[PDB]
Amino acid sequence: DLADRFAELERRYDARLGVYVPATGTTAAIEYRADERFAFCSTFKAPLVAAVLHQNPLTHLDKLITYTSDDIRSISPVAQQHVQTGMTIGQLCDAAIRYSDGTAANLLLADLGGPGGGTAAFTGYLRSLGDTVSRLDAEESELNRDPPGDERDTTTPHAIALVLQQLVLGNALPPDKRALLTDWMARNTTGAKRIRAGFPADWKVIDKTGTGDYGRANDIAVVWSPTGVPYVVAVMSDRAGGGYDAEPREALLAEAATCVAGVLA
């Protein structure tokens, strides 16, 4: 059965794999370790942008945010080029999703306001959507440690898949805001070797990745069949057993996604 295939990927990659695909009118749910916790890594940046879209009118996307060198934390491919000029909220949303810009994500968290530099506001947003599992505790920083077993900054494939489904396919955002989220995810630059690589080229794929130490490698996606039928695919992985320096394995996520594609096609 399907569980056997995922368990075989775990054995082969020396990894823990989590998979969830919400049930639909056309498919039963796919679940493997779907209610086990995995580090968000950068996958929270997609619902983060949704929180920002939700909390403001769309005119807010043109608000210019300025910041300094002291705000550059973690890989920030876009934000590192605009220290002098600043970036709009919309530009930050773009960067946070499409380039996993950490500084962009921290500035969006700030834009949410409230305690913890926005991490509470973000978590409250998830709570609002019906997610009582996921939590963000910590801003982006390349100095962050997050050892296995710590519940901080974690979600579950089940929880994050239901969130993404509400955001992109459901009614959590009005259509004008929904379209921006979808488009940013559709033009992501970081995901070509994960879920995208497990689905035939005639499927549409939009996604948001995350990568971390302990071999952490995640991808959350919405896919559309060649006949236009959408599904949400969350695949999360780590290799806590190999320690801090365990290599993330994108191919694990591609191959999990291949299994999923088989069930859905």
Indicate which residues carry an active-site annotation.
Answer: 42, 140
- Closest C-alpha to 231, from 8, 19, 1: 19
Q: Are strands 30-32 and 38-39 parallel, antiparallel or unpaired?
A: unpaired
Distances (CA, A) of 136 to 22, 91, 97, 139, 187: 23, 22, 17, 8, 25
Distances (CA, A) of 230 to 1, 4, 245, 246: 24, 25, 36, 34
A 10 A CB-CB count for 148 gives 17
Q: Are strands 230-238 and 30-32 parallel, antiparallel or unpaired?
A: unpaired
- Closest C-alpha to 77, from 92, 67, 88: 92
Residues tagged in the binding site annotation for substrate: 100, 209-211
State which amino acid sits at residue 40.
F
Which structural domain range is residue 122 located in?
2-263
* Tokens 């969006």, residue located: 108
CA end-to-end span of the chain = 17
Rounded-to-integer distance, Cα 92 and Cα 47, Å: 14
For every residue of the chain, which 3-state class applies, written as one string? CHHHHHHHHHHHHCCEEEEEECCCCCCCCEEECCCCCEECHHHHHHHHHHHHHHHCCHHHHHCEECCCHHHCCCCCCCHHHCCCCCEEHHHHHHHHHHCCCHHHHHHHHHHHCCCHHHHHHHHHHHHHHCCCCCECCCCCCCCCCCCCCCCCCEECHHHHHHHHHHHHCCCCCCHHHHHHHHHHHHCCCCCCCCHHHHCCCCCEEEEEEEECCCCCEEEEEEEECCCCCEEEEEEEEECHHHCCCCCCCHHHHHHHHHHHHHHHC
Biggest CA–CA distance in the chain, Å, is 56
CATH of the domain at 117: 3.40.710.10
Rounded-to-integer distance, Cα 6 and Cα 21, Å: 14
Residues tagged in the binding site annotation: 100, 209-211
Q: Are strands 217-224 and 204-211 parallel, antiparallel or unpaired?
A: antiparallel
Q: Which two tokens stand for residue 63?
A: 């608000």
State the total domains in the chain.
1
> Residues 107-135, buried b or exposed e (16+ Cβ, 10 A)?
bbbbbbeeeeebbbbbbebbeebebebbb
CB 236 within 8 A of CB 214: no
* Tokens 């302990």, residue located: 214
- Closest C-alpha to 212, from 185, 189, 238: 238
Could you tell me the resolution of this structure in angstroms?
1.8
